[PDB]
Structures are given as C-alpha cells and as structure tokens.
Structure 1
Amino acid sequence: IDGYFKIYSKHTPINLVRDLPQGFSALEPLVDLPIGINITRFQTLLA
C-alpha cells in the first residue's frame, strides 16, 4: 500500500491440535520496506 511493503508478525502460545484458537491478538509492525512493487501472487516454502 502507497509505497510501503509492510510485514507483521506475532508470537504466541497455542493449545489446539487442528484449528485456530478463540481469543484475540494484534499483529505489530516490524519494519517498513520502501519498495514500490506490484505483488499479486505467492507460494509457501516448506522444509
């Protein structure tokens, strides 16, 4: 958005086996990347 590539992350405990927990958390900003790119596609990297 508007010249920023903004990345958020959050680290919390979880206790579910197979689902998303109930409860609330907010993602804080880490760094503001000054890259004016057009991003429309992604792929997840696994090891």
Structure 2
Amino acid sequence: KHTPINLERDLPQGFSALEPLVDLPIGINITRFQTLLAL
C-alpha cells in the first residue's frame, strides 16, 4: 500500500488496509532476507 503521509516523523495513527498484489508459485524454503540500495 502506498499512501500519503503528513509531514511527521513517527508512524501516523489510523487505519489503511493493504490490498494484495501478487502470489508466486515457487515452493522454496526461506530463512533469511536482506535489502538492496542504489548508489
């Protein structure tokens, strides 16, 4: 979900449900995850 946020530091108060995007039929066991950046 991509929603507008007021100019604030902390997470806002309220409700915003998250619509689904995709499900993938992979069937691989997962134990760890990371993140990627652009430089």
Query: TM above 0.5, one fold?
Result: yes
Relative contact order higher in (CA < 8 Å, ≥ 6 apart): 1
Which runs of 5 or more structure 2 residues have no equivalent in the other structure?
Answer: none
* Stretches of 4+ aligned residues off by more than 2 angstroms: none
Q: CA deviation at 1:17?
A: 2.8
The aligned length equals 38
Which runs of 5 or more structure 1 residues have no equivalent in the other structure?
Answer: 1-9
- Superposition TM-score, scaled by structure 2 size: 0.71
Whose strand proportion is higher, 1 or 2?
Answer: 1
CA offsets 1:4-46 (integer angstroms, 9 cap, x no match): xxxxxx0110014321110011111111101101111111212
Percent identity for Structure 1 against Structure 2: 97
- Superposition TM-score, scaled by structure 1 size: 0.63
